[PDB]
Structures are given as C-alpha cells and as structure tokens.
Design an enzyme around this catalytic site. Sequence first.
Site, short mmCIF file in Angstrom:
data_model
loop_
_atom_site.label_atom_id
_atom_site.label_comp_id
_atom_site.label_asym_id
_atom_site.label_seq_id
_atom_site.Cartn_x
_atom_site.Cartn_y
_atom_site.Cartn_z
N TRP C 159 -6.49 5.37 11.10
CA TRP C 159 -7.46 4.51 10.44
C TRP C 159 -6.92 3.12 10.12
N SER C 188 -19.70 -5.84 3.39
CA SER C 188 -19.16 -5.76 2.04
C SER C 188 -19.06 -7.13 1.38
N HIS C 271 -4.47 -1.57 -0.17
CA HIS C 271 -4.58 -1.05 -1.53
C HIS C 271 -5.86 -1.50 -2.23
N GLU C 273 -8.47 -2.03 -1.06
CA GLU C 273 -9.44 -1.12 -0.45
C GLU C 273 -9.55 0.19 -1.22
N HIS C 320 4.24 -0.72 -0.98
CA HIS C 320 4.70 0.65 -1.15
C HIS C 320 4.12 1.61 -0.09
N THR C 346 -4.12 2.54 -15.14
CA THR C 346 -4.81 3.62 -14.44
C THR C 346 -4.68 4.94 -15.19
N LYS C 349 -6.94 4.95 -18.89
CA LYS C 349 -8.36 5.26 -18.76
C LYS C 349 -8.61 6.77 -18.80
C1 HEA Z 1 -8.43 6.28 -5.36
C2 HEA Z 1 -7.52 5.41 -5.02
C3 HEA Z 1 -6.07 5.61 -5.47
C4 HEA Z 1 -5.52 5.77 -6.73
C5 HEA Z 1 -6.25 5.77 -8.05
C6 HEA Z 1 -4.14 5.96 -6.51
C7 HEA Z 1 -3.34 6.28 -8.21
C8 HEA Z 1 -1.62 6.02 -7.76
N1 HEA Z 1 -1.11 6.26 -6.36
FE1 HEA Z 1 -1.71 6.18 -4.31
N2 HEA Z 1 -2.90 6.48 -2.52
C9 HEA Z 1 -4.23 5.96 -2.00
C10 HEA Z 1 -5.71 5.58 -2.95
C11 HEA Z 1 -4.97 5.72 -4.63
N3 HEA Z 1 -3.66 5.83 -5.15
C12 HEA Z 1 -4.43 6.07 -0.47
C13 HEA Z 1 -5.71 5.92 0.31
C14 HEA Z 1 -3.20 6.34 0.10
C15 HEA Z 1 -2.86 6.53 1.62
C16 HEA Z 1 -3.39 5.65 2.80
C17 HEA Z 1 -2.62 6.29 3.97
O1 HEA Z 1 -1.39 6.44 3.77
O2 HEA Z 1 -3.15 6.69 5.06
C18 HEA Z 1 -2.31 6.44 -1.14
C19 HEA Z 1 -0.69 6.64 -0.68
C20 HEA Z 1 0.33 6.12 -2.01
C21 HEA Z 1 1.83 5.82 -1.72
C22 HEA Z 1 2.63 5.84 -0.40
C23 HEA Z 1 2.87 7.25 0.13
C24 HEA Z 1 3.35 6.97 1.54
O3 HEA Z 1 2.49 6.74 2.47
O4 HEA Z 1 4.60 6.96 1.70
C25 HEA Z 1 2.43 5.52 -3.04
C26 HEA Z 1 3.85 5.15 -3.38
O5 HEA Z 1 4.04 4.19 -4.04
C27 HEA Z 1 1.24 5.63 -4.02
C28 HEA Z 1 1.63 5.41 -5.67
C29 HEA Z 1 0.27 5.71 -6.63
C30 HEA Z 1 0.67 5.54 -8.05
C31 HEA Z 1 2.06 5.23 -8.54
C32 HEA Z 1 -0.50 5.75 -8.81
C33 HEA Z 1 -0.63 5.66 -10.35
O6 HEA Z 1 -1.07 4.37 -10.58
C34 HEA Z 1 -1.64 6.70 -10.88
C35 HEA Z 1 -1.86 6.62 -12.43
C36 HEA Z 1 -1.51 8.01 -12.97
C37 HEA Z 1 -2.49 8.94 -12.98
C38 HEA Z 1 -3.90 8.58 -12.52
C39 HEA Z 1 -2.19 10.36 -13.52
C40 HEA Z 1 -2.64 10.34 -15.04
C41 HEA Z 1 -1.62 9.60 -15.96
C42 HEA Z 1 -1.88 9.41 -17.26
C43 HEA Z 1 -3.18 9.91 -17.84
C44 HEA Z 1 -0.89 8.70 -18.17
C45 HEA Z 1 -0.02 7.80 -17.26
C46 HEA Z 1 1.37 8.44 -16.99
C47 HEA Z 1 2.42 7.69 -16.58
C48 HEA Z 1 2.28 6.17 -16.38
C49 HEA Z 1 3.80 8.34 -16.31
N4 HEA Z 1 -0.11 5.93 -3.46
C1 HEA Z 2 -12.30 8.88 1.00
C2 HEA Z 2 -12.83 9.28 2.13
C3 HEA Z 2 -12.42 10.68 2.59
C4 HEA Z 2 -13.09 11.85 2.41
C5 HEA Z 2 -14.41 12.00 1.73
C6 HEA Z 2 -12.24 12.81 2.98
C7 HEA Z 2 -13.08 14.42 2.82
C8 HEA Z 2 -11.83 15.43 3.61
N1 HEA Z 2 -10.56 15.11 4.38
FE1 HEA Z 2 -9.35 13.34 4.45
N2 HEA Z 2 -8.68 11.55 5.36
C9 HEA Z 2 -9.00 10.17 4.83
C10 HEA Z 2 -10.23 9.55 3.62
C11 HEA Z 2 -11.23 11.08 3.24
N3 HEA Z 2 -11.06 12.41 3.60
C12 HEA Z 2 -8.22 9.10 5.54
C13 HEA Z 2 -8.49 7.63 5.27
C14 HEA Z 2 -7.31 9.76 6.42
C15 HEA Z 2 -6.29 9.06 7.32
C16 HEA Z 2 -6.56 9.17 8.83
C17 HEA Z 2 -5.13 9.17 9.29
O1 HEA Z 2 -4.30 10.06 8.91
O2 HEA Z 2 -4.81 8.22 10.03
C18 HEA Z 2 -7.53 11.24 6.21
C19 HEA Z 2 -6.54 12.31 7.07
C20 HEA Z 2 -7.14 13.84 6.58
C21 HEA Z 2 -6.41 14.96 7.39
C22 HEA Z 2 -5.22 15.11 8.39
C23 HEA Z 2 -5.12 14.26 9.63
C24 HEA Z 2 -3.66 14.33 10.07
O3 HEA Z 2 -2.81 13.98 9.20
O4 HEA Z 2 -3.35 14.74 11.25
C25 HEA Z 2 -7.05 16.19 6.91
C26 HEA Z 2 -6.73 17.63 7.32
O5 HEA Z 2 -6.18 18.38 6.57
C27 HEA Z 2 -8.07 15.68 5.89
C28 HEA Z 2 -8.81 17.14 5.41
C29 HEA Z 2 -10.19 16.56 4.62
C30 HEA Z 2 -11.24 17.63 4.30
C31 HEA Z 2 -11.17 19.12 4.57
C32 HEA Z 2 -12.29 16.91 3.64
C33 HEA Z 2 -13.67 17.31 3.05
O6 HEA Z 2 -14.51 17.50 4.15
C34 HEA Z 2 -13.44 18.46 2.05
C35 HEA Z 2 -14.29 18.48 0.71
C36 HEA Z 2 -15.12 17.23 0.36
C37 HEA Z 2 -16.45 17.13 0.63
C38 HEA Z 2 -17.29 18.22 1.33
C39 HEA Z 2 -17.07 15.79 0.22
C40 HEA Z 2 -17.95 15.32 1.40
C41 HEA Z 2 -19.01 14.47 0.74
C42 HEA Z 2 -19.05 13.16 0.89
C43 HEA Z 2 -18.13 12.39 1.78
C44 HEA Z 2 -20.17 12.39 0.19
C45 HEA Z 2 -21.08 11.95 1.37
C46 HEA Z 2 -22.11 10.92 0.82
C47 HEA Z 2 -23.16 11.20 0.02
C48 HEA Z 2 -23.48 12.64 -0.46
C49 HEA Z 2 -24.07 10.04 -0.43
N4 HEA Z 2 -8.33 14.21 5.69
CU CU1 Z 3 -1.18 1.25 -2.03
#
Ligand code: HEA
Ligand code: HEA
Ligand code: CU1
Lengths: 40, 264, 547, 254
Positions: C159, C188, C271, C273, C320, C346, C349
Amino acid sequence: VAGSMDITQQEKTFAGFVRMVTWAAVVIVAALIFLALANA
Amino acid sequence: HAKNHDYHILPPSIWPFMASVGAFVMLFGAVLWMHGSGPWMGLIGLVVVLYTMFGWWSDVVTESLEGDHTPVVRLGLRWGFILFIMSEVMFFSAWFWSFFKHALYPMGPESPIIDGIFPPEGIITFDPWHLPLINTLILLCSGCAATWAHHALVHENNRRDVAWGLALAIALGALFTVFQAYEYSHAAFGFAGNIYGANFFMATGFHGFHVIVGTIFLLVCLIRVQRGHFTPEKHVGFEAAIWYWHFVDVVWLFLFASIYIWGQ
Amino acid sequence: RGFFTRWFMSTNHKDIGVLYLFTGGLVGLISVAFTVYMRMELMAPGVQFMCAEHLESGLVKGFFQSLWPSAVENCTPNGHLWNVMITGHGILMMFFVVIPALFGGFGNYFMPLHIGAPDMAFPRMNNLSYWLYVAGTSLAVASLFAPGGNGQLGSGIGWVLYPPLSTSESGYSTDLAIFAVHLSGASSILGAINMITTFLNMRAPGMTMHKVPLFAWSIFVTAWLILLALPVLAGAITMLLTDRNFGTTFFQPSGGGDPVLYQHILWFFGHPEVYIIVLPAFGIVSHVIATFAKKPIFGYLPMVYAMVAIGVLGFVVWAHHMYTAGLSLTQQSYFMMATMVIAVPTGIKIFSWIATMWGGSIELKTPMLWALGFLFLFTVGGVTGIVLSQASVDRYYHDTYYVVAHFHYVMSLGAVFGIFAGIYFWIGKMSGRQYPEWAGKLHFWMMFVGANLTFFPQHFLGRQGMPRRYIDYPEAFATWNFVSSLGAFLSFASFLFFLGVIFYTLTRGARVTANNYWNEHADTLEWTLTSPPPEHTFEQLPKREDW
Amino acid sequence: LEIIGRPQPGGTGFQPSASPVATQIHWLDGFILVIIAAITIFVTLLILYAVWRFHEKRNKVPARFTHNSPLEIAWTIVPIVILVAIGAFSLPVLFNQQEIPEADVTVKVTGYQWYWGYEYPDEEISFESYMIGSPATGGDNRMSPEVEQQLIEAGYSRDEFLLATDTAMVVPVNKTVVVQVTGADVIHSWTVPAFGVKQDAVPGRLAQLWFRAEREGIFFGQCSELCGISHAYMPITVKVVSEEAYAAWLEQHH
Ligand code: HEA
Ligand code: HEA
Ligand SMILES: [Cu+]
Ligand SMILES: CCCCCCCCCCCCCCCCCC(=O)OC[C@H](COP(=O)(O)OCCN)OC(=O)CCCCCCCCCCCCCCCCC
Ligand SMILES: CCCCCCCCCCCCCCCCCC(=O)OC[C@H](COP(=O)(O)OCCN)OC(=O)CCCCCCCCCCCCCCCCC
Ligand SMILES: CCCCCCCCCCCCO[C@H]1O[C@H](CO)[C@@H](O[C@H]2O[C@H](CO)[C@@H](O)[C@H](O)[C@H]2O)[C@H](O)[C@H]1O
Ligand SMILES: [Ca+2]
Ligand SMILES: [Cu+]
Ligand SMILES: [Cu+]
Ligand SMILES: [Mg+2]
C-alpha cells in the site's frame, strides 16, 4: 433580509486565522533554519 | 421560504459528477497514452474536464452577479482560496525537499557514509544572472503590474489602470513561460537518467504549469474588467488572482535562490 | 427530486455524507472480502488457493477456482496474487474505505449540524469531492484488472508503493493506482478546504470555537492534517510516475536517486494519514461516552488541545517507519524521542474517557459498547506502539506480523469501532428507523470476540519472527495463523450480519417517534432537529439558548 | 549442527538469543512488557469497574464534575516518567547496536531478486544463497518429494523447508562480524532474529550492522521487505562454528 447578517464573530476569526498562519509559517522556516544550522 | 442567514444555498448541479467522469477518463486515457495507445481517450477527458471547469466557474460569476456573494460568502470564498494556496505550498515543498536532499547529501558510490559531488559530476548548470535574472525581472515586474491593477480598482475605482495593468501582467506572464520554454530548449543536461535533470525539470516544470494557470486566471479577470464586472467592495475573483499570482512569485523567488543561486 | 438529481447532483451535505457512508461500506466489503481470502490462504502453510495453475483458465473461471483449495502437489505458489491482495487490501482501506466513511460520511453530515450551519461553505465543491472519490475507487479497482507485474494482472507493491519495486514493476496497473491515489487526495483536499472554512466561518451566533462540539473539533483537526499532508503525497507518487513512465531517476540509484528519500516524503504523509483515520473516531467516541454515561465529557479543552497536540506533532515523527532502512543514529534517536512525545496526549485522552464514565449513570446501549470496545483496542494497540517506538526493539519487530497486529488494534479496529459506534448512534437520526438492540449488541460481541482472536495471535507470530507480505511460512507458525484465520472468518460473519441488520433497519425498521431518541445527555444540535432532519436544516439560525 | 535460530511450532516468546544485542533486545522487551502489561490491566479494570459501579441501575444520578487539576497532572507526569524510564534503558541498547566496532570478519551481503549474495572481501570468497526449494535448485518454491530429499542432503529436516538455503554464511564464534548490506534489484532486508540484526538492502547505499556470535549452530532469518513475486522464498542460513573449524573452511571455499 439578505446582506444584513452580523459578521463580527467571523471577521474576528479571520484576523486570528491570518495572524495564526503567518506566525506558524515563520516558526517552521525558523525551525528548518535551525535544523540546517544544527545538522546539515 | 423564511430564512434569516446570509449563507449561500445552492441548487443541484451536474458539474461535480460530470467533471469526475471526465477526470477518470482523462487519467485512464493518460495511462494508456503513456503505454503506446492513442492520446484520444486522454484528450476526451481533458476536454470534458476543461468544459466542466468552464461551466462551474461561469456560475460562480452568475451567482455573484445574482447577488449571492454576501459579506460572509465572499469572506468564506477568501479562506477557501487561501487554504488552497497553503496546500499548493505543501505540494511544492515535496520538490524543494527532493532538491535540497540531492544537493546537500548527493549520492556518491559510498553513499550514506561519504557523499558525492554536487552539482553532479559533468552537469553544467545555468548562469544565474544571464537569463534566469531576466525571468526574475519579468515576474517581479508583472507582479507589480497586477498590484497596481488591484490598488486601482480597490482604492481608486479607476477602471482604466485596472485593465491596462492586467494586460501588462498577462503579457509578462505569458512572456515568462515563453522565455522559460527557451531555457528548456537550451538546457545543458537531460531530463531522464540523472537526478539534477529530474529535480530541475520537475520543479521549474510545475512552477511553469502554475504560471500558465495564473496567467489564464488573470486573463479571466481582465475579460471581466472588459465587461466591467468588479466593484471596490465585491471582487473575490480579482482578489484571488493577485494572491495566486503573488504566490507564484514567492515560489519562483525560492526557486531562483535555491536552484539557480545557491545551487549553481 | 428524482433519484439522479438527488444523488448524482446533490448539494445538500446530508445526502453527500450518506453517499460517502454507503460507498465506504461497499468498498469495505470488497476489501474485507480480500482479507477473508488472505486469511484463507494463511490458514495453514503451503499454497492451496493462489496457484499459478489457476491462471490457465480465463478471468471469471480462474477466479471461482481460486476460491477453493488444492493439494500442495497440484499448486505452484503464485506469490504475485498474494502481493496484489495485500496491496489491494491496504490501498482500498487507507484511501477508499475508512477516511471516506468517517470524514466523508459522518463528517459531512453532522459537523454542519453540530455548529448550526445551514449548509457547507462550498457545497457544490462538496459533491466534487465525493465523485472524485468514486473516480479514484474506479481507477483503484481497474488496477486490479490491468496489465500488472510478473506477466499477470494487478500491482503487488504494498500500500506504500516503495521503489524501486514500484517504479520497475511491469504493466501499467501501478500507474492507474498512482492516479487513483491522486484522486483520493484530490477528493480529500477539497473536502478538507470545505470543512475548515465551514467550521471557521459558519458557526452559530454565539458559538465560539471553545463552544464547538467535540466531533466538530475532531473533524476540524482531521481536515487540517489532510490539507497539509496529502499534497506531499502527491509529489511522492508523481515522482514514481515520472520514474515509471518518463525515465527520470528520483529513486533509481544508477541515475543518482535514493529510494530512501521516497520513504521520507511518503511517510511525511504516511503518519498524518494514520491520525486522519482515527481522529474522527476520537470525536464520535467522545460524543457517545458522554451521552450514555449521562455525564458531560471530562476535560473539554485538554481534550481538544490534545487533538491539536497530536495534530501538530503528527508531522514530525514520520521516520519511525524507517528505523531499519538505514538512518543515521542521530536521526533514529530524534524520531525515537519525538514518537514518544506524541504518546503522551494520545494516552491522556484514554483517561479522560474513563473519567467521563466515572460518576455517571451508564446506559450500556449498543453505541456505548462500541465506544467502550474502542477504549480497550486503542489501549491494547497503543501500548504495542510504545514497544515499536524504541528503535532498539524495532529491529526485531519491524516488518513482522507484530506490527500488523499493532496497527490493526489501534487503527483498523479503532476506526472500524468508531464507524460502527457512529452508525448505531446516528442511524435513527439519519433514516428515521431505529435498529434492533439485540442485533446490534450481538454484532458488537461477535466482532469483539472474533477481532481479538484475529490479531492478538498475530502478536506471537511477530515475536516468533514471521515477516510481512509472506504468502507462505515455516510450518512452525501455523498454530497461531490458524487461530487468527478462525477469528477473521468469524469477524467476516459479523460484518455480514451487520449488512443484514442495516437492511432490516432501513426497511423493516421501527420508525422513530421523537427528535431525540436516546436520552437527555445527547445534548448537541442534531437532537433538536426532526428524527430525519429537514432537507434544509437551520433555515432559521439557532439562538444561543439552543445549546 | 544445533538448529537454534528457528520458529517453534506455535511459540509466543522470541527466538533464542545468540548475541549480546539479542540479549538486550530480549531484555528491553521484557522491561517494557511489564509496564505495558500493567497499563492495559490497569485500564481494563478501571473500565470494567466503572461500568459496574456506575451503571444506571447500580447508581441512579450521574455526577457533575468535568475537571480535576490535581489528578490531570498526575495523568501526565506519570507517563512522562514511564517514558523517561523506558527511554533511559533504550537509548543505550540503540547506540550499542548502531555504533559499529572493529571487524574480525567483514562480509558484504547483497540483495538480489529472490536470492542473496555474500562476499568476504578479505578472504576472497563469493557465493549465492538460494532457498533449498528454489527454482535455481529445481523446486517450484514449494514442497515436493524431490525438495524434501534435498533438505536432508544439507543436513536439514523436512521441518526447515522455507528457512533452509542451499549455501550458508559461516562465521566464527566470539568474533565480531560486521555485515555490510546493499541491494542490487529493489529493496531487500537481511535479518537473523537470533542475532538481533535487521538492515534493509537499499540499492545504492552501504548500510552496516554487527553481531558477535556467542553460541554455535545454525541460525535462520527471512527477507523483510517486499521485493517481488518470490519475496517469501529468499531466506538466510548462518552456520557459526569454532575458529579451528572456520579456518578449515576459509581455505576450502577458495
Ligand atoms: C490509528 C492510528 C495510529 C495510532 C493511534 C497509533 C498510536 C502509537 N503507535 Fe503506530 N501505527 C499506525 C496508525 C497508529 N499508531 C499504522 C498504520 C502503522 C503501519 C503502516 C505500515 O507499516 O504498513 C503503525 C506502525 C508504528 C511503528 C513502526 C513499526 C514498524 O513498521 O517497524 C511505530 C514505532 O515507532 C509506531 C509507534 C506508536 C506509538 C509510540 C503510539 C503511542 O502514541 C500510543 C499512545 C498510547 C496508547 C494509545 C496506549 C494507552 C496509554 C495511556 C492511556 C497512557 C499513556 C502511557 C504511556 C505514554 C507510557 N506505530
Ligand atoms: C484501516 C483500514 C483496514 C481495515 C478496516 C483492515 C480490516 C482487516 N485486515 Fe488489515 N491491512 C491494512 C488497513 C486495514 N485492515 C493495511 C494498510 C495493510 C498493509 C498492506 C501491506 O502490508 O502492504 C494491511 C495488511 C493486513 C494483512 C497481512 C498482509 C501481509 O502482511 O502479507 C492481514 C492478514 O492477516 C490483515 C487481516 C485483516 C482482517 C482479517 C480484517 C477485517 O476484515 C477483520 C474485522 C473487521 C471488520 C469486519 C471491519 C470491516 C468494516 C469496515 C471496513 C467498515 C466498512 C464501512 C462502513 C460500514 C461504512 N490486514
Ligand atoms: Cu508513524
Ligand atoms: C524568497 C527569497 C528567498 C530568501 C531565502 C531566505 C529564506 C531561508 C530559508 C532556508 C530554508 C531552507 C531549508 C533547508 C533546511 C535543511 C534541513 C537540514 O539540514 O536537516 C537535515 C538533517 C540531516 O540529517 P543527518 O543525517 O542526521 O545529518 C548528519 C550530517 N551532519 O536532518 C536531521 O538533522 C535529522 C533530524 C530530523 C529532524 C526532523 C525535524 C522535523 C522537520 C521540521 C518540521 C517541519 C514540518 C512542518 C510542520 C508543519 C505542521 C505544523
Ligand atoms: C510560502 C511559499 C514557500 C515556497 C514553498 C516551499 C517551502 C518548502 C521549503 C522547505 C522544504 C524543506 C526542505 C528540507 C530538505 C532537507 C534536506 C534533507 O532531505 O535531509 C536529508 C535527511 C536524510 O539524509 P541522509 O541521507 O540520511 O544524510 C546522510 C548524511 N550524509 O532527511 C531528513 O532528515 C529530513 C529533514 C527534515 C525536512 C522536513 C521537510 C518537511 C517539509 C515541509 C516544508 C513545508 C514548509 C512550510 C513553510 C510555511 C509556508 C507558508
Ligand atoms: C503538466 C504538468 C507539467 C509539470 C511537468 C514539467 C515537465 C517539464 C518537461 C521538460 C522537458 C525536458 O526536455 C529535455 O529533453 C532532452 C533530453 O532529455 C534534453 O537534452 C538535450 O540537450 C542536452 C545538451 O547538453 C543533451 O543532454 C541531450 O542529448 C539533448 O537531448 C533537453 O535539453 C531537455 O529540455
Ligand atoms: Ca497456505
Ligand atoms: Cu528480497
Ligand atoms: Cu524480500
Ligand atoms: Mg521496512
């Protein structure tokens, strides 16, 4: 009664938005000038 | 029926749907054009879009003459264009990033450890004072010509300098892209196969596309002055023309002091 | 007043929002179907469904053959299909499912109502954002049925379209996907411009920004991220487009390119995003927990400023995702620490939501469940983020299903729960027919059980070293991969059931009596309007006493 | 011949340590895992209890409060401390694994679409590691009768199918291997989970890792960056032997 509507709240908000964005834009230009003067 | 607010409510409109059918076809046909088949599917799209854009913006004048552009609406249209300009800056930033990186840390045969030579070995750059400064005086002058046009309508209601100034600005604007299309002809390096050519021709390339746009936009504003369409109070379209044009100037001034001056 | 003029020409934001919701569901189901087939193959090692042999049949034929297994002896592993499925899954979800249903769907509907606006600032451009979104989704689908890599159809890049793989993968399927993403950004950005202006310029008289409902704030911050991030992604993929089709060398090293610079520029969008996805869910959850705990949302301002904090910091933690790509230690250090800073607001909240529940009288109706479910998954997901934030530990974890598990908990399931929480909360208020409370609560519980048994087993597979984008694995993983593929199968039934629940609801549904059908503490401006609100809301601007 | 770096059929913890860095990654994860195990348990119970204690049946009238300036600072200072804690132990492990030392062995590893390439610049040795199931080793990147016999050939089981490669990078124990990595086709990624090292093979960049092998045996690792059709089917085998045995090999391969 078109044309009549009171805009004071919005015209204020627009002056803030302009004041904000201008401020924000220099901070970032400064931040990159720092970052370049630090680690280029 | 019975409202107290100044906000613009619109009747249903085809153009959103029609433009996105054309735009899908434009970009699909461009993919196929890029892979050997005929440009025709692409240019159908371009025409359907350019036809839609035309229709669209003709109503945003119709509505302004219809007295829909109240105080708030006009104000809102000003943010809309500024937010747009800001995201134009974010687009260009991706290209200044790509340049400044391959300029500060150019790729050498031992890359992350010891960087290479910039400008790339055997890339002969442009003399930043010979021609590019001609284009920097072409634009800085056209930016003054468009500001005298603004100050005329807004602070003098003098419709002669408004028209005159815009004509001079549109002229120098089209002259920039003409003079720039010579700098491309006389380019001492290629487009394909090197980063400098890639960073150069894409960065000035998009700016030139933005100049072309900004000149077409200014011409629509002059065409309207020909029809006496603006007033000192109501001129959002004319306002965004000078904003957009001044934005283009800022972008060039960066390009000049980035690619040409600092990066020679 | 005809099916075409109403849905293909609408300038009424409430309809355009409904369009977004339904298309998001449709593309969701498509992309969810991709995941049921993905876990189908990953159910146990060896390739059984994605066999090169199925290629010798035609498109329609070889399709329905692929849906049914084979023996390891009669199956040549076609990895390409696998890659196109994972790419198809991601691209659809990140660009055409989740943001559209949250930002496009709910955001367009309610944000104007929440602030007491008659329409949006630019309601004709509003429609353009929807139809450009459909155009992108078309090009995206086309990418799956197009001259693609390794002599087949479809782009199997991932992706994030990493180069030089992206730039050199054959066919033109990728170029469609490029332009599909281009239009999804164009959608968007226009949507964002609209939302920002609307929020700032069209509030009710007397409603300062410190009086704006939380959902509106959540959409407002989301729009700012979109406004600034998506234009950077445009440059990124344009550079892939010229490398692919106009022979430049932005990321080709033989000409002087750096494939790492792509990742910087992409993840500068990448991010933000991921915070564009979840931020509206933050809002929806805020509204739901406050309603059904009959208590004013704990710590308003902070909450907002947390959203502003997350929103600002979201740009300057991007690298990161690149800890392994070969970054200077100084760099890796900075992005390690900055990433830790984001974690604080984060986190906070999550506490505020618990504090809103504290003291109140909790009506455990369906929307409250989903919002509560979100709280759990967002913690479970968020804590694994802290682990990954430490670059040291990332080396082991990076590009393993441990990350997949992390980002599903926090983002996929987080936003999905956000979407469902929104749907049950506002379904009466949008249709005029309420859902059956038994079915809703069932749909929640099936999802919560299934979706945990889907991705928590993946944590193990990551610690055991199973890497991302692998069509096949050592036998020594298969235990957990079966546990996951079960939960994922169950989950698919939940989402199917839901599609029934709404079908029942929209047709055989209990017509809703009053304007507010929840309780007194659903106290925002939408519950003042009729249960299906007038085609022209707020013709008379609401006076201060209305909130 | 002791297969160490390897998945166990349904394991949940890490892969066996084999280096001082892989000990510290095992350590840091455990330290963090306590703190995260606490925070989720703490949040889960606060949630569950609140839902019970404050259900509209168990408690009739809601509370009115909205702010708590003391407790809210408690909510902030604590996670900042928690993060300064984890940070203080994680920045050391990071510098240690990234500051490269003096190399006993130097190896250059190159990523090629669906095989690897090793160079010992000093000892003048070069060779390519294909997967035992490769189409360069006859197979269809799948299990077959033929493919199993070849696994036995190299001293491996049917178990190790997708891990075992036709040629291995061999290394002396207690010697600091500096592995330099570049990509040739697209981006590949070299990892050995037991050694605790991951570095992407990016075309046009000389990226470096190091690992000091403490035990002897066979260690595996698979490619960790999507590189095309056979991205699953290009793994790594690192045989580490004694300095006496390794000196015997360094003349043989020549
Ligand atoms: C919904 C969006 C979302 C959110 C909210 C987050 C919340 C966080 N996530 Fe991430 N994450 C992604 C969407 C998010 N992320 C996506 C899409 C990828 C992968 C894309 C891809 O690789 O293909 C990703 C992959 C990712 C990586 C890289 C892994 C890798 O590919 O090697 C890292 C490392 O830095 C990371 C760090 C974090 C951290 C530190 C927080 C923290 O900010 C979270 C805050 C803590 C919590 C929510 C838990 C509750 C905590 C409290 C209530 C009190 C707070 C406690 C302390 C501060 C100790 N995220
Ligand atoms: C945020 C969007 C999103 C959502 C919804 C999901 C829903 C799920 N995905 Fe995730 N997935 C990604 C964003 C999401 N994924 C991305 C970005 C990658 C990276 C591609 C890559 O690796 O390069 C990934 C890669 C990924 C992989 C592995 C590919 C690989 O590494 O080789 C797998 C398999 O285990 C996985 C399992 C699932 C399953 C079982 C569900 C679900 O089907 C399970 C349960 C959840 C639901 C049934 C919710 C479905 C409902 C909705 C989406 C709401 C639809 C809208 C309305 C109702 C208005 N996803
Ligand atoms: Cu990030
Ligand atoms: C118009 C007339 C023209 C007149 C001209 C006058 C105007 C002057 C403007 C000049 C600005 C030019 C910009 C150039 C900036 C260069 C940036 C830079 O140098 O940083 C790169 C640096 C290198 O990395 P590294 O490998 O660690 O270096 C080691 C070798 N010594 O990288 C590092 O240090 C690693 C640490 C990474 C830190 C990342 C920080 C985040 C980025 C800053 C935030 C910007 C994001 C925008 C925010 C918007 C949201 C609010
Ligand atoms: C008002 C109109 C103005 C015209 C529009 C143009 C504005 C944009 C001007 C600034 C553009 C940013 C340029 C930054 C380039 C910095 C150079 C760079 O890429 O750093 C290299 C570094 C990795 O390099 P590496 O290979 O690891 O180094 C090894 C050592 N030999 O990689 C890094 O560490 C990245 C360094 C951080 C750079 C962050 C870039 C964020 C881009 C956002 C800029 C937006 C500007 C907003 C200003 C407000 C405008 C109103
Ligand atoms: C619609 C959106 C617009 C934004 C994109 C902008 C696109 C800009 C396109 C620039 C076109 C580049 O054209 C380019 O072709 C030739 C080969 O590469 C160059 O090179 C030519 O001159 C050089 C002389 O030293 C030699 O290296 C070459 O042998 C010769 O072919 C031209 O000097 C250059 O002008
Ligand atoms: Ca399988
Ligand atoms: Cu590879
Ligand atoms: Cu790979
Ligand atoms: Mg990677």
